[PDB]
Amino acid sequence: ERTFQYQDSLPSLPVPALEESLKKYLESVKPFANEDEYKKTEEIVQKFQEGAGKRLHQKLLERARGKRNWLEEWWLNVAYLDVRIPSQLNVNFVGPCPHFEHYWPAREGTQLERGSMMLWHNLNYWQLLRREKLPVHKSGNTPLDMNQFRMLFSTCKVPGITRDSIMNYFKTESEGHCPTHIAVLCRGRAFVFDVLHEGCLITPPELLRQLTYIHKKCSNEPVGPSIAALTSEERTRWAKAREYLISLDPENLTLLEKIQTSLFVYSIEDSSPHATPEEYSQVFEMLLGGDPSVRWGDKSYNLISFANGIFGCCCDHAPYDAMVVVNIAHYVDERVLETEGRWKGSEKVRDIPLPEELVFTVDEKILNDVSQAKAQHLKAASDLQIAASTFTLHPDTFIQLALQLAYYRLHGRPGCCYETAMTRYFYHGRTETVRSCTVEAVRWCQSMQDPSASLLERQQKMLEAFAKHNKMMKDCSHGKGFDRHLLGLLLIAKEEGLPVPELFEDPLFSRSGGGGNFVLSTSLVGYLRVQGVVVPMVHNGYGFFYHIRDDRFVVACSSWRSCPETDAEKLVQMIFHAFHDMIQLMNTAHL
């Protein structure tokens, strides 16, 4: 069985029935409206269903007739590539490598040695992919889309004046040649080297030579031009700064393309984030912040190495979702556990070429841009608040409802929430929106705060909320959600010059979360001991991500300090209390 052999067998992303999607939409705005607003919205939806929407829907079905995935390209552009804000900080997702839970605890002096093995395992995964030896993901006996795995290596975003683009250089052995070099960033400088030698992959001892070489060289020397810091800028500023950098020297492009085609970018940091199984939120902060001087935000996969032997990842969210990175992170974690975090093979170091430094041609203008880039990234990131803690009926649904109750208690109102639902059953299927703030969840939250409510009442309502959410997640993951569908109708119109339908202008559309206005942006990161996070979707919102273990729940939460109402730490504390009451409500209500 080969990694991508089922791709041509995957079904097309479906287009839900119009009436079904609109009904689900109407039901979702209820928690945020009164009689009047709801009547207005219902009226708007009925007319849409009878006129314009019916026609736009027909056009959407025609699009699907010619595309195995009618949404893919649109989603990429509208959700990522067209957005102009600095993506590195505001869109890229980040997460620490969990190796400090066992064999690689925080410890100075282990950066280079551990680093050599990190590269080794990461590279063995790439070989697994290129040879299509990576196991096909399956739901029971149903194959799932594996396309995102092609975006892990040799993939990089390129800034555009109005729209960015994704360059995917990865290729399997059966397809052709794939770049075989990685890029290393150190002390505001860039280096690269081939990972193959005489047909085989270089070993840790050989990788340790390359890293030590680069590290010692830059350590006692002034920081370089830090061209990489520009990748953290506003998309248009970066595009222009990039064009300028290129005009100064036709060769500066070749250097850029070398970084772009590299299997991945490895960053060497001098910082040392406090990382222990208990407290490690500081790792998220340095990952999202850090020193842009050695980060390439446009890279789909940027492996980060800290001074105290800790590791982390920062990835462009545009080309793929977090699960691919979670998978390689876990793969490496297993390798570290099996080898006790050591290399027990040959210590021989063959005669392999030394890392070549990528020296960019710059001037006073470029240097001012770089300086500006760092300043804006550091300033923007400095306003970020991170809270990461471990807590020691589907688990996912449980946490989602717990979050609803927590937000409700902390802010006194239902928080419109966005939960990622994967749609990998379909060709190139990525995500769908699950709106956790349902009528059922709100009714349950009220009962939880109602002194006259009995235990049976609260339990019965909590269960009704579980049933609703479970059905929701199932339908969404199966292509029956409605958020992407409505987006599709909107894009059909705009793409043809037709006006924006009144439904999207309705106050309740955005109040319910539509248009990227969710105050709670969330997602399960799996059950592979890996954790990650991203900044909130809105200024007065939160980012809440988590992963599940058989004996514990791990959560990571983000909020903006500039918003006095929100507080990441307080919300986490609130949800832990929420888990408790929910548990007790089941035990106490045993009868």
UniProtKB/Swiss-Prot annotation:
Instruction: Identify the pathway.
Output: Lipid metabolism; fatty acid beta-oxidation
Domain of life according to the entry: Eukaryota
- Tell me which residues bear N6-succinyllysine: K30, K47
**Residue window of motif Microbody targeting signal:** 589-591
Result for mutant: G532M: Loss of activity with octanoyl-CoA and myristoyl-CoA
Q: Which GO terms describe its molecular function?
A: carnitine O-octanoyltransferase activity
Binding-site residues for (R)-carnitine, renumbered to this chain: Y418, T420, T431
Its catalytic activity? octanoyl-CoA + (R)-carnitine = O-octanoyl-(R)-carnitine + CoA; 4,8-dimethylnonanoyl-CoA + (R)-carnitine = O-4,8-dimethylnonanoyl-(R)-carnitine + CoA
Q: What role does this protein play?
A: Beta-oxidation of fatty acids. The highest activity concerns the C6 to C10 chain length substrate.
PROSITE patterns cross-referenced by the UniProt entry: ACYLTRANSF_C_1 (PS00439), ACYLTRANSF_C_2 (PS00440)
Question: Can you say where in the cell this protein is located?
Answer: Peroxisome
Catalytic residues at H317
What's this protein's name?
Peroxisomal carnitine O-octanoyltransferase
Q: Which organism is it from?
A: Mus musculus
Q: Which UniProt keywords apply?
A: Acetylation, Acyltransferase, Fatty acid metabolism, Lipid metabolism, Peroxisome, Transferase, Transport
Question: So what EC number does this one have?
Answer: 2.3.1.137
